[PDB]
């Protein structure tokens, strides 16, 4: 209600007056315009907040609101005489002086629109769903062991080694150079993918890709640091819809280039590098906010956290989030290896991983739309539902584990889509059962600790299973052990249920 709410109600009332006739009842509308103009005079804007008040560079702002309120006077003194046509020309003059005078001290009024175009355009990566067919094609032809037990373990250790140090640098740099560093990380990933020479180059590529998969929370933190808390809900919803639509558009564009357009994979990654340089340009065209999370103290956080240390439902959803998130990332990091294992077709257009990615993103958006609508009491039917979801995950991983048929893996693609139906169905519920108990800073802290423990569990399973000095096991026995792991989780949560 400092500057932006008065600006929004002034814009809404001006849009009402612009399409309204019969000016006897626009007097309430014009005096609400006057109230919104007079209330936004002592507002101290953030681009003026760094400068001292009562300055000669501030007098243009007050003179702009001076001529604004003066033309509101000129409108309403012609509206009180029973006239209906002078108010429209006065509103046009109000529009021109609002565009001229006030907008000098307003940086950018398409911030929601620019974040929507950033979610719809700068998330387009058509080579995302074809990384493993590019690594295992006629170009370089990595073997299955060198892509299973040597590349993605470095991805797991790098995700740990960029979640632990770089999270403070993410919170500290006010999130515009954080997204710039993420764009430069995408540039480094596709330059190491287009100029690969050995396996350690792809290890460095996953080292730079861990920053990209770890800086997804930084986008919503940028939204919370830019958009006010009196506007964060609707703009955050449209931004999440824009991100999901951008991922779906990326997967559909990958299917149109690879399958339909028959574009080669090197040219596919050329297109991906071009759109990621466009994403770097869009990250350069951002706006740096001020109110960061953990840098713009500790005793109040510990006092508010002490009531949420040993809660049973919070610990249940947190341990479920850690275990099922570790299982989710261990399925996603190897499911492309499985898809290139079962159907190793050398033709480029006969690879339908992007269609499975688009259907999985769509079903995840549907199940996220069908997660907050659960008006069911979570007293008794929680742990049995968790056991059923983990049993569904065990069944889908077991279906992915024993499939050795070329025509069935199609449905197994959809099974991975159904795996999102067994994962994204409870992710907004796991967000709602944590965010509704603490403050938003403590909410981000609890989700960071949960992601940290999920990374610990993933790192332990990576260090034990895929290491050649310990077990030394191929991907088939890894998927069998993952099916046994989800079955054991189903047994544990079923014994916890009843």
């Amino acid at each position: 209600a400092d500057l932006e709410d008065n600006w929004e109600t002034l814009n809404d009332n001006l849009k009402v007056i612009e399409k309204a006739d019969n000016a006897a009842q626009v007097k309430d509308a014009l005096t609400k315009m006057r109230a919104a103009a007079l209330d936004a005079q002592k507002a101290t804007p953030p681009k003026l907040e760094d400068k001292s008040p009562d300055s000669p560079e501030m007098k243009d702002f007050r003179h702009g609101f001076d001529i604004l309120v003066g033309q509101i006077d000129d409108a309403l003194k012609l509206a009180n005489e029973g006239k209906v046509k002078e108010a429209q020309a006065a509103a046009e003059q109000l529009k021109t002086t609002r565009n001229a005078y006030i907008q000098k001290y307003l940086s950018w009024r398409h911030l929601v629109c620019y974040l929507c175009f950033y979610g719809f355009m700068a998330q387009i990566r058509p080579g995302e769903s074809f990384i493993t067919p590019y690594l295992l094609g006629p170009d370089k032809n990595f073997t299955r062991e060198q892509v299973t037990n040597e590349i993605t373990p470095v991805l797991s250790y790098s995700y740990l080694a960029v979640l632990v140090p770089v999270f403070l640098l993410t919170d500290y740099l006010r999130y515009t150079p954080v997204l710039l560093l993420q764009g430069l990380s995408f540039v480094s990933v596709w330059l190491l993918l287009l100029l690969g020479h050995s396996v350690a180059h792809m290890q460095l590529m996953e080292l730079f890709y861990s920053v990209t998969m770890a800086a997804r929370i930084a986008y919503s933190s940028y939204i919370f640091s830019l958009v006010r808390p009196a506007r964060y809900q609707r703009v955050a919803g449209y931004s999440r819809a824009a991100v999901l639509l951008g991922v779906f558009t990326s997967s559909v564009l990958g299917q149109l280039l690879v399958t339909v357009g028959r574009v080669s994979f090197s040219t596919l990654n050329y297109i991906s590098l071009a759109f990621l340089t466009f994403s770097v340009v869009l990250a350069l065209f951002l706006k740096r906010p001020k109110r960061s999370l953990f840098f713009n103290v500790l005793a109040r956080m510990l006092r508010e956290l002490g009531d949420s240390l040993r809660r049973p439902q919070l610990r249940l959803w947190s341990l479920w989030w850690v275990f099922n998130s570790a299982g989710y990332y261990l399925v996603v990091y190897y499911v492309h290896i499985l898809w290139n294992e079962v159907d190793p077709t050398t033709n480029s257009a006969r690879v339908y991983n992007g269609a499975a990615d688009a259907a999985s993103t769509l079903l995840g958006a549907i199940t996220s739309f069908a997660a907050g609508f659960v008006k069911i009491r979570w007293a008794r039917w929680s742990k049995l539902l968790i056991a059923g979801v983990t049993a569904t995950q065990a069944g889908l991983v077991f279906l992915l584990a024993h499939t050795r048929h070329p025509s069935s893996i199609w449905l197994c693609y959809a099974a991975f889509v159904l795996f999102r139906g067994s994962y994204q169905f409870l992710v907004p519920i796991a967000t709602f059962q944590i965010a509704s108990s603490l403050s938003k800073e403590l909410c981000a802290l609890v989700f960071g600790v949960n992601t940290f423990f999920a990374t610990i569990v993933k790192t332990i399973i990576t260090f034990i299973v895929s290491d050649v000095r310990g077990l030394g096991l191929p991907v088939r026995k890894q998927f069998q052990l993952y099916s046994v792991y989800f079955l054991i989780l189903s047994i544990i949560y079923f014994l916890g249920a009843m």
Partner: antibody
Amino acid sequence: EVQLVESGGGLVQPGGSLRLSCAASGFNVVDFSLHWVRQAPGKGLEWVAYISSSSGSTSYADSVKGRFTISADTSKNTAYLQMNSLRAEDTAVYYCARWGYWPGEPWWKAFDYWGQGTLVTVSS
Amino acid sequence: DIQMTQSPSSLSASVGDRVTITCRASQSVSSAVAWYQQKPGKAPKLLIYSASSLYSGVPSRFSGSRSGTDFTLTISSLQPEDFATYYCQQYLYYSLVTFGQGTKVEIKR
């Protein structure tokens, strides 16, 4: 000093005509607008009408709309409030008040120099 | 047109008592309200303008505050001269002068 004075109030019949004169000793009406405020005996303050000699903005209150009229002159530096077809509700004290134009010191300062206030009564 | 309600319509205090007269608007009126002190029979006087400022002529024992659409007159040390009727009037436009109801303060007896 600058101040206000009112004249013309007295006894009228219900439905008659009466012309109040508001004079501003000191300032002129081209730099400040004039206002009329009704106060019934026992009741509270309430607004009637205003006039601005810079442009002309004779906009009235809904209880007195189309029944009163006002005309201000800057050569005599005064304002005539002519009232015809009155009712029994207008037995009240009318104050003529100064109030400034936008912006700054004239507008943000409220009705600062109230007048002495004339008194009108309605009785058959 | 709009209303301007003024709740403590009958207050009472002795010499040197802090009183708070509140006043609620109907619309989202900006920080331009007027607190007036009218003696019984005499003319009103501008006491507080723009909801926070002190007028040149009234003493320093008068102030006010804004909380959304709730304006507040505060008197710290109540002088025995200050037993009058205090009126609340939002000034937003020329033709939207809507006074309150008047709060005739009394002596604590």
